[PDB]
Design a protein around this ligand. Sequence first.
Ligand SMILES: Nc1nc2c(ncn2[C@@H]2O[C@H](COP(=O)(O)OP(=O)(O)OP(=O)(O)O)[C@@H](O)[C@H]2O)c(=O)[nH]1
Ligand SMILES: Nc1ncnc2c1ncn2[C@@H]1O[C@H](COP(=O)(O)OP(=O)(O)OP(=O)(O)O)C[C@H]1O
Ligand SMILES: [Mg+2]
Ligand SMILES: [Zn+2]
Ligand SMILES: [Zn+2]
Ligand SMILES: [Zn+2]
Lengths: 46, 34, 1105, 65, 49
Amino acid sequence: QPMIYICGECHTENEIKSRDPIRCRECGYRIMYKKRTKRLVVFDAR
Amino acid sequence: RCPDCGSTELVEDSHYSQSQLVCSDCGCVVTEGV
Amino acid sequence: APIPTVEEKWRLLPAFLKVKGLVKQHIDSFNYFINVEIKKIMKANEKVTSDADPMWYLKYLNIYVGLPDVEESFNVTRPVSPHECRLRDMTYSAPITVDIEYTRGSQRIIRNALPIGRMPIMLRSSNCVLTGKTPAEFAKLNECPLDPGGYFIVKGVEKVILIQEQLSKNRIIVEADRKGAVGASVTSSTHEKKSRTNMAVKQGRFYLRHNTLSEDIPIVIIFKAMGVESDQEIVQMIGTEEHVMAAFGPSLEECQKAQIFTQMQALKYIGNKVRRQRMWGGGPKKTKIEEARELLASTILTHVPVKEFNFRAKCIYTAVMVRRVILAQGDNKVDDRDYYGNKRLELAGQLLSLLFEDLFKKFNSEMKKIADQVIPKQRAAQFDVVKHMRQDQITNGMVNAISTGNWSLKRFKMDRQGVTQVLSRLSYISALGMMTRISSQFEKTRKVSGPRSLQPSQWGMLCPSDTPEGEACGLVKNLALMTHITTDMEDGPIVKLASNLGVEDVNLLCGEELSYPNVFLVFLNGNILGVIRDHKKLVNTFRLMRRAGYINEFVSISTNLTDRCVYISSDGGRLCRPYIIVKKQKPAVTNKHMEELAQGYRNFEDFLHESLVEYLDVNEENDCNIALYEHTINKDTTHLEIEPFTLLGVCAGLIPYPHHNQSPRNTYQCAMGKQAMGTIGYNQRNRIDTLMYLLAYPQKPMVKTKTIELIEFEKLPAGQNATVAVMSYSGYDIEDALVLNKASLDRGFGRCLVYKNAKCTLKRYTNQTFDKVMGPMLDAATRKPIWRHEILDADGICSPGEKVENKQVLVNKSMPTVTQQPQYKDVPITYKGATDSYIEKVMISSNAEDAFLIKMLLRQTRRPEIGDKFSSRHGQKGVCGLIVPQEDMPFCDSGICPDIIMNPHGFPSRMTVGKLIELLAGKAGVLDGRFHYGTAFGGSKVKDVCEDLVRHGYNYLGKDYVTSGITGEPLEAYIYFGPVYYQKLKHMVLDKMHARARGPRAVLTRQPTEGRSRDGGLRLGEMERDCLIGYGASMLLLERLMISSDAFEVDVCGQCGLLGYSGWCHYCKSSCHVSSLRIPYACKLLFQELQSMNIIPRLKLSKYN
Amino acid sequence: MIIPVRCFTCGKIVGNKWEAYLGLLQAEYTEGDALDALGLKRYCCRRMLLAHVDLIEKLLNYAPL
Amino acid sequence: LILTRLLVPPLCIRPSVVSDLKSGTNEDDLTMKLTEIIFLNDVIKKHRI
RNA sequence: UGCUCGC
Ligand SMILES: Nc1nc2c(ncn2[C@@H]2O[C@H](COP(=O)(O)OP(=O)(O)OP(=O)(O)O)[C@@H](O)[C@H]2O)c(=O)[nH]1
Ligand SMILES: Nc1ncnc2c1ncn2[C@@H]1O[C@H](COP(=O)(O)OP(=O)(O)OP(=O)(O)O)C[C@H]1O
Ligand SMILES: [Mg+2]
Ligand SMILES: [Zn+2]
Ligand SMILES: [Zn+2]
Ligand SMILES: [Zn+2]
């Protein structure tokens, strides 16, 4: 299963599997955020 | 198992800051308090 | 003919803020520490060698701190931003390296770059990456340009070293004792030893007391021991006044009672009163007289130096001290400790210097021990320090001292606590005010009520109104807007100029000249510099030379005519304030100089060099005459106040028209503004803290002080302007409460955001096993994840964008139980919360230890409701009492309905006319599209805003014709409408709401836990028990304190009176006399503890009848 | 952060008059005459537009992008 | 009045926390004091022997 | 244990 993440400075979609050293291509930053979910979320305008 | 109905559906459900292992079928409180 | 006034004079304040001011103090101190002081410390311990195997040494050449880097990469460094250190929960430090030369096998081996430690780098310092950066480059580094900086980042947390306040060292203090005896004390402190020696008059004669003497000895014996043996010379040194001789007579008589008449006899008598420091190693060989002479020369009065066993200066010093005691024994001229002229402020620089010196000495001692243990017995393989230079010592020491905040220096015997504190990120004002905090040496634990008072010496230096309301009232203070802390000087040219100015040497003349009325003593940092005549010329020449630039501008000179002492202070930590020099009823600063400053021709340094503005110390300003304004300048005026509103601090600067309000109101306003909710910085979105409060639509105030423009608060506001009408409505605003409009809250007014952090760690243990996150446990019945694991993604980590409910897992963490197949038990991170939260972001990082750190930023959007605390920027804290609809709100002719209705009854008891003035100025400003100023001791007058109101067609007093919304009929009295800058506080009813079921209990004592985060219950205190006793409710007290709290049923044996178990007594080996008994569990615990203490309680039970 | 759509007190639509107000600031108009030309008679909308700080661009400068 | 035996209290008065996050446990001071007393008794017996 | 707060 392709697990995707976003770098902190390049902001490119990187696919890494379990037990991998947290890194990103074409750079060396080590802050990796998770993309937003695709599930529907309901909000109230109140 | 539940002491009343004999079911094995014992779930740990904390009700308002009270840890409590209770049967899920008849609601019999098996254990409470930690 | 009024004196001309320089209108642009206040322009001197921002220029001063360009090089100095609020945050530059700690920055400059840290830079001086890492650039100059560290090199001096390294030079002081440049060579270290061991006694065994001579001709071996380790010589330090030069030490460097470098740029901050991270040791994440394998044996490779990498530049790291402070925000990255905040995210990764690591420290922001730079590698302390040093180049050295040593001898391995008697062959000299040199190293040019060998790291030895890691120094935590203060933000915005010289070596910090944030300095010399543009706001765009700050955005590239995810750092706010308006961030004050100056704080350390350790393990992801922001620590600030508070400015320490202490008494000045090497100063005579004349004070009364517990029994009323007026004695003296001097704490002579050198770079090595600090010794407080006292002098008492307990029996009409002066005894000298020191920690190195078994019993206090007469002062005349010490005089005879220090070289001067003639009693006439002693009396001349003490004084020639008749009352002085009459007071000193008993001491001479007591000395003549004994047979002490020579130096040898006095030294022997002193040595008899000397006790060995618990069998000091080494053969004494008749050191009694030698020990006495060494204690007199070195231990006693360390700050007074003896050239070569010549106690002339020390004799003169103790004679002056005795004379001061004699003079104080008459008229009660007792010096006060709260006088800030005798106070010294230690910044982070001096503390870090002492800590680095201690750590380097410990490292050198450890290296010498390793050398002594390794070199003489190991092998022909020559020992080298490089194989034993542990680099974690200094790093761990610095990290622990900065994080924990407790400093234990055995070399100085200093045991301090609370030195570093967590930087408060409630708002920009909170951090900006906490950065300029100052703690007291009193270290509050008791009701002293002697330093807690507001002394007049705090003028211009410390803020009078800004103080934490509570137990820390008066002992935690804030610096003023315009203030500076001095550093240490070389003290050479001062001595040279003093010697060249006619100061006669004290060794050339006897002490009788000290008793002359026209002879004035000149001191220097507690050392007797000499004597002088016509001290006016000396003071004028010294001040003129300081103004010329040949003497440092921070060297202070003061004169005390009561004691006739000229004090010359050059030590660091003294508070100084800039003042405009006034010569012959006309200030040196003119309109042309201010025009040149505005055009950029000159700066504040040019004003300093051209003898226009000079720094004055508290001791120096004690003798100077300062004028508040130009019209106050008279013939006897030496200086002019730059700006009066600089008296207030940073937090006090937010108060509009503070001189129209009461001082407790200003204090409460500062305390609440330290907790005001609002934006933190431009990087508040990428910032992930444990608790953050943000405002949906922050607005800058309409009535803004010049301090607000100086601190750039308008760029980061922490409140909103609402159309407040001062009136009584529905009786839901009785005591400090306020009524909010439902339509206003519905349209975004007061909307707030609460961001919380949830952090989890997946660390590798000693064994080759790691914490792993399992996927969502899908339900086989529906082929979907369960309600608990609903929000989890495919990797077992909750994905941002969804809502989290109570008792739901965010990270499905499972950890092994071994440290053959690994056995994993689940320890998921469940979300404890009354309301739902939304995940904004999930950050996953990896440390050098292969531990994965996962941080989820939960967001909650909250609307003002009943129970939310609101402030009005005037100390008028209030709680929302009722939320009425828009139609129920009263309306004016224009149709404007008020958002906040406040009670008028709060005004008369508190006299907050400043609030009314702010309301009027804000109304005028929103009418004419202007921003009025509420500057302290100034600002826009009432007449101007009244004219602005009458020009726009509104009433000149704010009161407008208003029709009641409920009945539809006009009100009999006009309502005071106007825009007021209300700020919401972090105190919310949702977070403070608590309810306790049976819940959990403590293991030791089976009672509810303490806090709300621990699901604790409310405690019935001793006073509540007293009230229940007074009411006489025995059954209610029994049910509360026994039945509902710690009820238990024990088994007591009626034969021996001891406690049994399960209806059986092990003591008597029987069960016939065992009976059940109800009891509090704490009582059973007490009985068991008493039985452990051999205090056996024997219970004789009986029937209830 | 951003200009609110509705006024807190009255409720007049004010979010659509923000950027144009900035245009009036890019022009030679002052604060008062611009607020008058925008049609804000009551002082509540004048306070809403005048006391508002535009922090959205400062945050977008720190946005991922 | 002169003690020759020491009454060690039950575990209810001496709660022990099993901190599985590290290789150690949280114990009260009374347990450490009793441990030191037992060690001193053993050392005295060893010196007597 | 420390400390900042809330009255
Ligand atoms: N330095 C430090 N000492 C603590 C801390 N928590 C407790 N202590 C010490 O432990 C004593 C109080 O213990 P408690 O706070 O009752 O411990 P507890 O909360 O019952 O511990 P748990 O059962 O693990 O929750 C104090 O005298 C402190 O010296 C802490 O976070 N840091
Ligand atoms: N240390 C404390 N001990 C007991 N009660 C306290 C303490 N601190 C605050 N309180 C509670 O807060 C109340 C104190 O308020 P009070 O002193 O009467 O007004 P205030 O704080 O002076 O307000 P103003 O400054 O007059 O506007 C009374 C008390 O129940
Ligand atoms: Mg109260
Ligand atoms: Zn990248
Ligand atoms: Zn018995
Ligand atoms: Zn409006």
